[PDB]
Design a protein around this ligand. Structure first.
Ligand SMILES: *[C@@H]1O[C@H](CO)[C@@H](O)[C@H](O)[C@H]1NC(C)=O
Ligand SMILES: *[C@@H]1O[C@H](CO)[C@@H](O)[C@H](O)[C@H]1NC(C)=O
Ligand SMILES: *[C@@H]1O[C@H](CO)[C@@H](O)[C@H](O)[C@H]1NC(C)=O
Ligand SMILES: *[C@@H]1O[C@H](CO)[C@@H](O)[C@H](O)[C@H]1NC(C)=O
Ligand SMILES: *[C@@H]1O[C@H](CO)[C@@H](O)[C@H](O)[C@H]1NC(C)=O
Ligand SMILES: *[C@@H]1O[C@H](CO)[C@@H](O)[C@H](O)[C@H]1NC(C)=O
Lengths: 49, 272, 33, 49, 169, 50, 49
């Protein structure tokens, strides 16, 4: 008599993503040799990072 | 600066079975898969331009198939965009024989965009300037550099450009051929070398040319290239054991091809 | 041609061997799946 | 053999049909929507299957 | 010194945002995996499939994912589903005995835990003792195997069935 | 031959197949335009592509 | 002959039934309603048919 079904339950989860390599950091904007005055306040675009 | 290429020498040719590419990044082995995508239909009409030193205006029309057979790098890059009057973003792709440069911000684009080489002694020489390709640049949201597209017989270079959902996709292939009967009869699928999250609207394009100076010298040259257009069609692609598109069927070419797509096989037995 | 062949591992006749080759079985995966 | 194989393939490929619901995969239905409004979509998937 | 970060989430594709992290890759074990947003469950195994360098997934004739490429180690991992099956209970009548055997249909005896464990082609048979005899079939189990209630104390035995008494005319 | 007060015309399956013209008072049969399956007769591709 | 004719006539008659929709003429559902409701009504007709 076919009484039930069984499953093997997944023990644990894994998550994998590619190497964390290409970062444009904020060291270039915080470790600046000299900042910019307010009337000429420096501005940088940050994209694809 | 802006000395024009007043030349088209337009012609028309058969596409045969050329512009097939990989529609996704999925491996498949020994399978026949039906894909409904933007393809270059079999045996369509591809325009064959000869450029010698006007109207280099071209549309985009859901995507472009581009091909060339020039031995050297007379063909360099491409200009893409809806309207090219420095109002909205304009893609620009350029090769400098060591990398490839892609920019997006609006450019002036003097009405015959072309590069020049003009041997120097300034640093050493050979900087291939840009001053009147587009004059000005501002508000540049994207920029990209890579190993150059136009690498390296006859050496057919095929490119497929399309623009979907803010992504500019570029597929290509470099097939060395011998008979040189323009587009050869056979099969060769184009792998997806680049995807760019550019998010701009592309409607017109143009190419770019080299034009060395004599010693404005601008020594004359000849560049031959084909352009075809892509539209939505269903194809039956045949992936071999390794995952390579080895063959394809255009389901709307003729009644036999529609039968092949219905049976989902490349061989059909006697019957109705 | 119809009697079992003893040389072969499975004791099938030549005609039965031909029959089993000629039909390509699909859903016969039982022990290992 | 072929008739049964194609019946099974029809059954399997009918799993990925939304039957009018907002999507076919159950996990997307559950995460995107709250339990009451995702209940309708899940019930439609259930009756279709 | 003052720095102000201003965030644009315009309708163009997004390209700047935080690390996604990665946890380690458990092979030979039914896990709940997620490779670059491709989620699923199953047993990950090393494979000899050769993807093309731009190809990240593998698909089956029925459009289900058979393989992945690990986004860090450029390695192809086959994915098999976890080991579901049916469970049948073999019994002599309760008029006879309260003793039973269990068949786990179409699964390997190794992964049974959800006493006389035998591996048939119908599945894993538990609680029946296999014998090197042959009787007329009593309870049909599967690929040539039957079960019966035997004496030599009574127990449940599994055997390969007998097609009949041999006879040479 | 419609009766002078009738406008439509219906089949057994309750589909219109005649109309009286409101201007010339003429009766026009209606026929569905045309349609049907399309079959491809082939010898084997092992034999011809015709 | 009669059974075949009866089956075909029942199939044809099933076209002029609402199946819970507010009309049985797809043109009416299209014209008199809006997508977020005409679409659902048409889908219910499709399920019935
Ligand atoms: C450079 O930036 C790092 C950020 O981690 C900071 O700790 C360090 O003090 C900075 N050094 C200089 C010289 O700006
Ligand atoms: C292009 O190449 C030339 C020489 O090959 C080089 O001087 C120049 O810097 C390159 N341009 C870019 C943007 O990399
Ligand atoms: C790719 O397919 C060819 C036949 O078309 C075969 O000879 C070759 O071995 C395959 N590649 C690999 C890595 O086996
Ligand atoms: C059972 O599993 C072991 C290892 O897990 C394997 O070696 C064996 O072949 C398997 N048997 C069957 C019938 O699948
Ligand atoms: C990822 O980083 C690891 C460092 O352990 C390195 O061995 C591996 O080659 C890298 N892979 C990619 C695809 O960057
Ligand atoms: C309708 O008008 C036409 C003129 O366009 C006329 O010839 C015809 O007799 C009229 N019929 C009726 C029923 O009014």
């Amino acid at each position: 008599y076919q009484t039930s079904n069984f499953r093997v339950q997944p023990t644990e989860s894994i998550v994998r993503f590619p190497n964390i390599t290409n970062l444009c950091p904020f060291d270039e904007v915080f470790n600046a040799t000299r900042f910019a005055s307010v009337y000429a306040w420096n501005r940088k675009r940050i994209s694809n990072c | 600066q802006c000395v024009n290429l007043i030349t088209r020498t337009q012609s028309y040719t058969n596409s045969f079975t050329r512009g097939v590419y990989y529609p996704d990044k999925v491996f498949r082995s020994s399978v026949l898969h039906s894909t409904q995508d933007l393809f270059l239909p079999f045996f369509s009409n591809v325009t064959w331009f000869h450029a010698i030193h006007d109207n280099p205006v071209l549309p985009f029309n859901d995507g472009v198939y581009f091909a060339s057979t020039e031995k050297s790098n007379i063909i360099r890059g491409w200009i893409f965009g809806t309207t090219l009057d420095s109002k909205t973003q304009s893609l620009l792709i350029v090769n400098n024989a060591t990398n490839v440069v892609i920019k997006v911000c609006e450019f002036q684009f003097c009405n015959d965009p072309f590069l020049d080489v003009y041997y120097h002694k300034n640093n050493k020489s050979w900087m291939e300037s840009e001053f009147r390709v587009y004059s000005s640049a501002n508000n540049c949201t994207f920029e990209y550099v890579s190993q150059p597209f136009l690498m390296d017989f006859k050496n057919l270079r095929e490119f497929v450009f399309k623009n979907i959902d803010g992504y500019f996709k570029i597929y290509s292939k470099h097939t060395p051929i011998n008979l040189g009967r323009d587009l050869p009869q056979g099969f060769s699928a184009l792998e997806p070398l680049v995807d760019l999250p550019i998010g701009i609207n592309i409607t017109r394009f143009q190419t770019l040319l080299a034009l060395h100076r004599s010693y404005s010298g601008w020594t004359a040259g000849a560049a031959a290239y084909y352009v075809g257009y892509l539209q939505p069609r269903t194809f039956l692609l045949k992936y071999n054991e390794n995952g390579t598109i080895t063959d394809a069927v255009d389901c709307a070419l003729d009644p036999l091809s529609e039968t092949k797509c219905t049976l989902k096989s490349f061989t059909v037995e006697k019957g109705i | 041609q119809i009697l079992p062949d003893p040389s072969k591992p499975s004791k099938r006749s030549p005609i039965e061997d031909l029959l089993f080759n000629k039909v390509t079985l699909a859903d016969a995966g039982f022990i290992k799946q | 053999v072929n008739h049964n194989a194609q019946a099974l393939n029809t059954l399997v490929k009918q799993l990925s049909s939304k039957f009018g619901a907002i999507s076919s995969v159950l996990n997307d239905i559950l995460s995107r929507l709250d339990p009451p409004e995702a209940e309708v979509q899940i019930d439609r998937l259930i009756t279709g299957r | 010194r003052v720095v102000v970060l201003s965030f644009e989430l315009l309708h163009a594709p997004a390209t700047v945002c935080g690390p996604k992290k990665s946890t380690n890759l458990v092979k030979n074990k039914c896990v709940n995996f997620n490779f670059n947003g491709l989620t699923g469950t199953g047993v990950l195994t090393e494979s000899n499939k050769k993807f093309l360098p731009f190809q990240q997934f593998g698909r089956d004739i029925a459009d289900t994912t058979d393989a992945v490429r690990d986004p860090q180690t450029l390695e192809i991992l086959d994915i098999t589903p976890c080991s579901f099956g049916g469970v049948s209970v073999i019994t002599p009548g309760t008029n006879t005995s309260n003793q039973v055997a269990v068949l786990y249909q179409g699964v390997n005896c190794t992964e049974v835990p959800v006493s006389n464990v035998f591996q048939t082609r119908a599945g894993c048979l538990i609680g029946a003792e296999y014998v090197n005899n042959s009787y007329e079939c009593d309870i049909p189990i599967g690929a040539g195997i039957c079960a019966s209630y035997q004496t030599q104390s009574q127990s449940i035995i599994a055997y390969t069935m007998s097609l009949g008494a041999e006879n040479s005319v």
